[PDB]
Amino acid sequence: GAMLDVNFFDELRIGLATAEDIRQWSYGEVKKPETINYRTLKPEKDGLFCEKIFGPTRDWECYCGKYKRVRFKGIICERCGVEVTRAKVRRERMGHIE
Amino acid sequence: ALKRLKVVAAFQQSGNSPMGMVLDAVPVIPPELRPMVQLDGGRFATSDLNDLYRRVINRNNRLKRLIDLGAPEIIVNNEKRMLQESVDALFDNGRRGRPVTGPGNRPLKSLSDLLKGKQGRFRQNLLGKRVDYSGRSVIVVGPQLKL
Amino acid sequence: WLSAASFQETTRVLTDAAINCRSDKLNGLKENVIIGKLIPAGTGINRYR
Amino acid sequence: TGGLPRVQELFEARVPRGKAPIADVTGRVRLEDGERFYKITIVPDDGGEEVVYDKISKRQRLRVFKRVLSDGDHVEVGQQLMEGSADPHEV
Amino acid sequence: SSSNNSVPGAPNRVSFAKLREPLEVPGLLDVQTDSFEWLIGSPRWRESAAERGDVNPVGGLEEVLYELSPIEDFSGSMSLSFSDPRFDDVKAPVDECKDKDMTYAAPLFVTAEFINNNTGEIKSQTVFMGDFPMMTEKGTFIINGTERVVVSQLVRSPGVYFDETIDKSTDKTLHSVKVIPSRGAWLEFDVDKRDTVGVRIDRKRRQPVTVLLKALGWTSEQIVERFGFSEIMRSTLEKDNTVGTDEALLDIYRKLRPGEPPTKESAQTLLENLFFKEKRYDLARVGRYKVNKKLGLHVGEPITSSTLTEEDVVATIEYLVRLHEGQTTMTVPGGVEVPVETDDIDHFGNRRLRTVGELIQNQIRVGMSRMERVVRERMTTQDVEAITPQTLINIRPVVAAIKEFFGTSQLSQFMDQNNPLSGLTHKRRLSALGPGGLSRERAGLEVRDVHPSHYGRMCPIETPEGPNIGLIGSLSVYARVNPFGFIETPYRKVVDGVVSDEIVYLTADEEDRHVVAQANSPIDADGRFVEPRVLVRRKAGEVEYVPSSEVDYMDVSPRQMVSVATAMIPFLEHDDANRALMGANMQRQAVPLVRSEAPLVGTGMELRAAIDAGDVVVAEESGVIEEVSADYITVMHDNGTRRTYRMRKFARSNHGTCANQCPIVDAGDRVEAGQVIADGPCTDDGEMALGKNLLVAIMPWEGHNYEDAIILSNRLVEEDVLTSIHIEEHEIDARDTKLGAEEITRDIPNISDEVLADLDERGIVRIGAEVRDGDILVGKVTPKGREVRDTSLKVPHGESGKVIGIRVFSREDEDELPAGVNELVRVYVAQKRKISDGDKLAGRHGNKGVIGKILPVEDMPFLADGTPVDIILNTHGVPRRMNIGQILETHLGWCAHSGWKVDAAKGVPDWAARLPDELLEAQPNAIVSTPVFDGAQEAELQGLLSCTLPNRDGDVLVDADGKAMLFDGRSGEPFPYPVTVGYMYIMKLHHLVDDKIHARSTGPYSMITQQPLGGKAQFGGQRFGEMECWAMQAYGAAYTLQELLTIKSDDTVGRVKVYEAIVKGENIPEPGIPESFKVLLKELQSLCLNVEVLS
Amino acid sequence: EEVIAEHPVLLNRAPTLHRLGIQAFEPMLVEGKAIQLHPLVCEAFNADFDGDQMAVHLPLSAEAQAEARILMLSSNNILSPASGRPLAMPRLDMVTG
Amino acid sequence: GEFIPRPVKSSFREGLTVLEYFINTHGARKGLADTALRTADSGYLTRRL
DNA sequence: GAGGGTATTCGCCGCCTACCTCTCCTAGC
DNA sequence: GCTAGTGGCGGCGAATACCCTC
RNA sequence: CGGAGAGGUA
Ligand SMILES: O=C(N[C@H](Cc1ccccc1)C(=O)Nc1ccccc1N1CCS(=O)(=O)CC1)c1ccccc1F
């Protein structure tokens, strides 16, 4: 209805969620039980913290590092595949398990 | 029949199918709502949600491996049962069977424990908050003051 | 269902609300407190504000 | 109950505990005396039907209203026969 | 007339007591020391047990090793065993361990023997079992540099317990029994409302007792011969609807292990392994002894077994049926007669004490069981003729168990070190809650009550005030614990109504069979009782008058029931229970002061309390002091040897206080063994001194002492009467970091050279430098990428003082630093705190309050000679709270300070007939003692008040009523009526207002939900809970509540906009959606719920 | 000194059993670290002076200040909302005098 | 809760004996525990109301 | 066999608010 | 240093397990 | 500042 949240709320509706809804919310699938690497302290790919699913961990930076400036705004990297945006996005994006 | 009709009418009046009770996919909460911190020295203290998601993923992956590779009915059924139990523990830990406990023999927190109780989401964060521009100290008596 | 879930028995209330597909009209003190809106009482009433 | 538990049970609309039966039709009563039970029969003035309470334990006393309740005594529609707390649901 | 004559150099404190003490107070740290030296099997314990129970002397470790060994595999062709545990010297001394953050421990070795049954070869080795933490001489452990105290636990003893209940729905008396083992499986019997006896193994369905009886092999003839006299048994044999030993075994197997083949052999094996395994079921020695005593099975045989038996079960069932059939005696075949009755579960004869040694033994036992599993597994997958004891034993689980116990246990607790009394009472503490005890919330009102069996074993006064009320108690003065773990207490035997001097220790169950008189029973210079009838105590809290020839025992003192802290309250019997409890609790919160002074009026339980606590220095051997200094004392013993004692100066306690020791001997004085040679934190000449003597007035004054507030003079600040020293500890470390090599140096970028004035060349402040909030303590830079940032150590908000010491550990000097750190500099800053408004004072009688005001000396009420009063207490708090012992203490304190002389020109006055000689005269500032229950009377107090010495000029300022005529310091007019003045003992509590003031405008926020952090140390915000929201909604204040909930807590953009608006002249903007609602929506979606916001 | 002039401040003591557990006052700077409370509001707060502590909150916006100054001012709440009896009246030492 | 047939004839001005103090302490601690339980029980009722 | 009652029995829910100090955080190759 | 995994108690309602005729 | 435990204040 009101996307994230915007004033002029009218109602708050609840219901059962289908598999289609779950896959629509998802930005990607999680298929490795890896959280974080200890040698580099960076998220593991396809893990519970993968940056290609949940978004960058730094403002306007990619996992590979090809783009690290505000100019490369809104473009998905062609090497790492992480969309270049702000780091607060990790509080909003959800994955899913097939 | 009164109770059966209560539930059946609940599912009939609305435009909602009853097929939502069986799950073909599991959502994963955003990482910033289940952060993992590091203790003095550089050793991580993993959250409880991460452990449950990890167990679910392990069991699902090994079940998929067994299914693809081909195996007798018994092993596939056992893996399916263990996956069922893992997802049940993730959603509501301790409801059925022994709780999935971590180190120290203490039950892990589930997605259903973030909302319930005196320390749950509602009563601890939405009905009450911590605020700025606030202080505290001991009170003494001032007779000279006015009302 | 928000006021009921914030009072007691969160799991049962939530499952019943999900099954019945209940819609919550945010007309109440506790609900407006939860969503951060002016309560419909005192100085938050239309004739006063 | 006689304090905070009494207040809680009043506000929770529970059965009092020491429930005291209350009449439901005006008429005379044929009180019976026995061990571990009393038979209180309501004989209405109209006489359409007779109600009876036989499970009343002898531990509870008989309320005094207007003299103690006795056989062949007329009672009100909402009179409390025994001594105790009547449940809010019957009234 | 004096108090003590045993301690050599004790002050002469004269007592009002009229009773002689047959017995001296025991060592007050004996429980912990004895329990631990039993565990390690020290020679001292060996001798102590030999002079009594020499039949079976074995320590805890030896017992565990005997229990565990031998370890044999299934085939039985090989075995392993352990014996003779041994200890080496401690690796490092106690002070070294405390300084270097080590653990005080000693290596432990055991002898392992490996025997092969088919070859006859024996291979023996000495295997190292890991370092074993060792208790110090003061009853504490040093674990990772922190002193800890292991607390004794009150637990329900193993045994068999019978109880009775009256059912609600029907009128019946239903009986039950429970056989509670030590690490075993429960077993229950009961008779239900259908007059049928049954069984309930663990938490399964009920079964008739006949089923089990036949499963044991009995038949109808056997069961009927013995049982059957009870109608219930003969009725249960009819409706069982089953018969046959194999059938009963199969039924039991079905009930125990559903879904498995019900075979007779499997059922028998499972049952015999459940209740007769000797490894899965155990009663211990206490359990076996208690079961034998209750059922009267074995009276001569020793306690050599620890498992159940058929005779025990049949005796239990017979006992149950006889109890249910209203009988009062029985005689099981081959046993002595015993009465049948129910058991009170809270009786002190039924619940025992697990001391430190027993808890450590349990942990060692579980660790060794894990090691045994490992060794048994490893014994079947290894080649023969190549296995040696060292190749089979894995020590990791044992050391892990010891680490876990001493680090993360509920009974191993951070020691309390406000003052010596706090620690002494912490070591003598009994707690009912722990791993195997009660719950702080679920516990009911009947487990928290005072029981008649507590008399002389647990103090009824000293307990917490919060949710732990009644769950934590303190051991009594004369009590001790016997080998089985039951608390004892001494009694003085009397024969034919003549009190003898022969002390015997009795447990509660033993004591319940006799009647014991009070210590305050008149005597006629010998044991004979003066009066013909005596008031005595009986079984269940009952007192009766009995002829003097029927008395069995007698208390050793009228203070047998109180504890150490409660025995230091003068005029205790004049105070109500609540205020006495408060005073006993609050004596343990006093802070050490710069200078100490002992009370004018005490009780005598202060010299021994100070000596036994251990914070004073005592001369071990006689000699002559050779050299005395502020740092050490040297004693020249008679035999030519010397010993030097080092004084710990300006040390820091676990609670930030100061622990400074001062010598009290001269350079030529001669000392005696056991004499106090130096003072401690709260000690004055070897006596506890927790406060100061102050001249008090008991009037209300202008509303400044309104509602428990206090008024103080300014002399107490000018003369540093109530000043204290507090010490803080700050530390920082330099790690390797993934970025690399963060360093401590004085080169910090973008900092003025003035800000770096106090730092030395290394980069740390200089000793003796004054530090204020925000000041640099250790300059450090970390390479966040030059990019080196500043991550130096600062002084927290509201903290200041003088730097008095620095300790730096550098890896370059081969220091035992943790992994990944190079430097671990520590900084100590101390500050003297004077008394100020908001600080908490208190007397010994439960009177407390914060300092409302501090007045100039020029405007305090003063006596006719011009003496201001130091403190003013309000009149309206005394009579309502039923603590009138403070007024009596005030009167006696004035009498002691002023001095007196009874004018016995023509015989002593009748009120001084029983007053001890040496108490008919005193000099100014005389120290006296009034024991807790045998002290000064009211008539004696009146007499002393009526005869006191004049002041310097020769005038008596306080009349016979204890009241003086004061002047008004502000107007100079005399007050219309006389006021009550005197001296009482005031203590300064560790509740200073400097540690409680906190304010905030903005700071850290939590990450999951963007709300302010909570905590003074975190610079957190004050919580606005649900009830405050209810109050705001009741006021009708909508905008205030909205702003509090949105822009002050978690409106991420609203916060910054509000700050900008305020720092400019603009007005506050409107709020927005808080972040917690979004977090809730995300969690609900994660629960697979389709939540949407419609518009 | 001039910034805090006529800026109301809310004081609260837990537990907040009824409405008068929160009230607004006019701050005035004092020397020390303890808060000085009027003797006539102790009954409303249920506060004695044996060690109690209180929390302070600052209203920011114009509406919040108006509410704190009109609705919640201590001198405007003299009577008990439950029964109407006065709560800010003399007690103890004042009654004796 | 029932009264004992034996009274405490001493007052706190005179000082209770050791057997008249034991029972007094029993009663006092019982009252304190009851007060704690009552304060825990009243808040739940207030929240429900 | 088949309707009419059971008739306990077992599982789940609930159990005041606010603050302060201190210690520990997985085992195995 | 890296990888893997037999001390709470009341209230309420649904559910088995149990007859009771019938 | 994430969690667990222990102790204390009103
Ligand atoms: O009763 C007295 N003192 C007894 C003294 C006593 C203490 C410990 C052991 C044995 C005796 C008492 O404290 N009992 C006791 C202690 C704790 C809990 C219950 C009990 N009781 C009460 C008297 S009870 O009903 O018979 C049976 C249970 C007493 C003496 C003098 C004057 C008046 C008195 F009420």
Ligand SMILES: [Mg+2]
């Ligand atoms: Mg108070």
Ligand SMILES: [Zn+2]
């Ligand atoms: Zn890239």
